[PDB]
Amino acid sequence: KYENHTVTLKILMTLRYVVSDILKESRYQYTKFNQPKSKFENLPQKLLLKREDVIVLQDPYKVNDGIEEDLEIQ
Amino acid sequence: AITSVDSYLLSEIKPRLNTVLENCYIIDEVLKDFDYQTRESFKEAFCGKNAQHEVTVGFNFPKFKNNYEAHYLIQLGQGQETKNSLGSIQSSYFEATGDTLVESSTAIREDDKLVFTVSKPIGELIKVEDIEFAKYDNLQVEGNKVSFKYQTNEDYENYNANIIFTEKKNDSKGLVKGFTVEEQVTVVGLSFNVDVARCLDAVLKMILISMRDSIEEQQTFQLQNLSFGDIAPIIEDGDSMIFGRPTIIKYTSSLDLDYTITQDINKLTFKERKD
Amino acid sequence: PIQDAKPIDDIVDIMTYLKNGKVLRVKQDNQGDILVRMSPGKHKFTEVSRDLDKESFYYKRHWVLYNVSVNSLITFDVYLDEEYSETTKVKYPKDTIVEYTREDQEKDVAMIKEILTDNNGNYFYALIGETMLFDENKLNKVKD
Amino acid sequence: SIEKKEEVIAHNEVVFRSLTQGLYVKEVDIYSDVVSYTKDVDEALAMPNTINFKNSRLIMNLDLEPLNKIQKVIYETHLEGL
Amino acid sequence: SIEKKEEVIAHNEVVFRSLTQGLYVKEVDIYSDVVSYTKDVDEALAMPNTINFKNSRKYKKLIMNLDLEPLNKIQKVIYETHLEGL
Amino acid sequence: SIEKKEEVIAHNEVVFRSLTQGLYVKEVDIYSDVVSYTKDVDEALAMPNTINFKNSRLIMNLDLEPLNKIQKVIYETHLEGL
Amino acid sequence: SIEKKEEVIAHNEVVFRSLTQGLYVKEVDIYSDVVSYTKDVDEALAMPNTINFKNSRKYKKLIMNLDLEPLNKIQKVIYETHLEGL
Amino acid sequence: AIQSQEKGTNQLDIGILDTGTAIGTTQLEKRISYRDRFTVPEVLMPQQ
Amino acid sequence: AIQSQEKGTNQLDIGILDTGTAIGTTQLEKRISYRDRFTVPEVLMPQQ
Amino acid sequence: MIYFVNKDRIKKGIPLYYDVKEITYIATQDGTVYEEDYEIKNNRLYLNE
């Protein structure tokens, strides 16, 4: 029916980001209190992200689990 | 046959460059002018089959990292139209012909003839090395082989020769439409050490000269015009700068297309006026 | 009858087959079928591939690591890949909900568990909680 | 199977090999006597294996095994059934 | 006496033959169903099958077709060096 | 109704169809014997349906149904009352 | 024997005829009232009526006029393929 | 964690184009790489 | 909610032109789209 | 990083741009690679034929 026509749409899409630069990359701490010995731990990084509009890839294929959500047990 | 100059540069450079760096004698001739210190340090690094360091080549805006110790970088550059022809016509051919090839072959002993065999149909022959076939030889082509008669040539049953020939595809005669394009392409060497860059540029100039003898260059890419820029810091936001001398290469080539003709006249009938 | 499906019941067998290195095929609900594998070499870890079709001169399976969960294995259907038949051409697959009339002409809902056929392709179905067979026409698919 | 095949002989030449070392000839002097030897079979000094060349000069040296060399290059295609 | 042997692959593509007709496909429609046939290996439809092009998508509806017989076409050049004594 | 109409015949040609497969001719060999077949009616190999062409060469092949083909294109206008 | 039939629309516009005079309008004034008449379909005033131009405004005062009879003019080209045996 | 989610839009000769920018804060012991990718199924974005 | 309602005016060769800018804060669960449109009947703006 | 292998690099060993402490993931057209086929010495990489 719409062989020669112009179709216009409004759509909802899932949000996506990619990493353009890493800001305040590595932050550190020699945690020692209440430990057998000194330990090194990496504190949170900060990321500068950009949205994917010029190139778009579909959402990743995640392996599903058979566990039913909101399951009642007894 | 639209010509991708950028691809041609890469095809020629990659094999020839490796061969030049492989041996030391040629490098000495190339770097004859340079001082002893720079000459040998470059040779110690890249020259020889046993060179740990190696040179690389690639196009601009790659998403990976290049070997900034030594690298050749290419970018397409401008293009312009310079000369036309009437009806945009270049040439007319009776046979659909592809590239022009050079092949080596040995003569084979047939009964009446000695024949050379080639990997593809011969189409148009151009030359067999240092043979001027006389009419009594009756030189002729057949499929993928070329033949000349045996008598008074009997010492040559084992003749080893090179052959220049064209790839034949079809018998469909057609015309050529196109024009000449004046194209410029940029080439630059990169390093974090200026001395390496100067040696690298000089090596490039030599292989450009050698390319003047190539089949593709002689037939398709003519009228070299080289232009060199000033040594500049390509990069400054880093632990050390990158230095490179850009060069500009100009070419003259044809952008051609094949137009096929089907109106072959074979019959011809004369009829007089009834009056 | 047709033996297109040979589901594995015990996960212990699955692990045993995995130790043998044979590829598995794990079903998913409203999602693409997947293949699972144990890596060769010194380090043993589970690998997965989204490529289902058979290995060929034009088609090579792509394998990558993953932290697969036993919960998917123990719950979802599992098969030996090479022994699996792609489909069983019947109107209502197994575990499909249908509405049927009982022997006393009273209507009840049921799900299907049977595979029987003559040599012409005529199929019969036996319903969960039922004994006798039911034809393709008698059963009616229950809409979601 | 084979659908199409052709064999063409690129070169026919004579190569020189030392009888003592077994190294092939790489470079020679003014009168074609050897100055350098190499182990490479193909890089070895070679000349066309034609009768006229022999009359035009094997002749020069004694620690000399004049060997013949031939190159075969073959173009073939296959249709491998399933 | 064979001295050195080298094998090189020029091309590697897939060609499809009809079991009944015995022809090779040359063209397909918008739906990728056959439009034409040809009895020439050099002119037949081809799917590139070098290493980078494996696991394609363009011809899924073609491959699944039972009447078609995929064939792996390979073109090779081999160099054989000889020594023949004195 | 029709206010103005005219019919013009763009082409008159002869097309070749195989009797066995029913596929039309797409390409032919040196002597116009078929090398390729196609299902398309219009893309099929065709030639003008003129007497002179027949004398200038149906002739060549036996699995051959020489069919005639004609194209009609019609220009028309309407005034559709209310 | 008709083999393939295709129908194509070249133009689609609206032409107005006077019920009494029987002429077609060719021109209008600032108020869009008639300035002139013509007895020629090719020269008559036209309102474009392809799909994008529907529901216009330029000729409201014209359309409401009872003396005028709007007419939908359509121009077409149809292609008819034939086969006539041997 | 994510902050300052921004949809910057550029109107150009080539057309309209979206160049959004945002700032993220991660967990401990995670090393991120240039041109890594994140996707938020829960959040939906409108387009025309 | 709206803030910093601004009537920026540019005097140009083409004439005078208004390029105003303002900042808005919305309700929950509302997704806005590029080049959406708002109008405030209550507020009146003078022009000549 | 990504590198292209040839008949010469395979014998010499790949010269790595960066340094190395440990490797995480390796892949090619044939898929991943295992410890039995690759080795690293003096910040250059060797591979089998």
TrEMBL record, chain B:
Q: Which Pfam families match?
A: SP10_terminator
What InterPro entries does this protein map onto? SP10_terminator
Lineage per the UniProt record: Viruses, Duplodnaviria, Heunggongvirae, Uroviricota, Caudoviricetes
Name recorded for this polypeptide = Baseplate hub assembly protein
Highest taxon of the source? Viruses
Automatic annotation (TrEMBL), chain C:
Name the record gives this protein: Uncharacterized protein
UniProtKB/TrEMBL annotation, chains E, G:
**Superkingdom per UniProt:** Viruses
Q: What is this protein called?
A: Non-cytoplasmic protein
TrEMBL record, chain J:
Q: Which domain of life is it from?
A: Viruses
What this protein is called in its record is: Capsid protein
State the organism of origin.
Answer: Staphylococcus phage 812
Provide the organism lineage as a comma list. Answer: Viruses, Duplodnaviria, Heunggongvirae, Uroviricota, Caudoviricetes
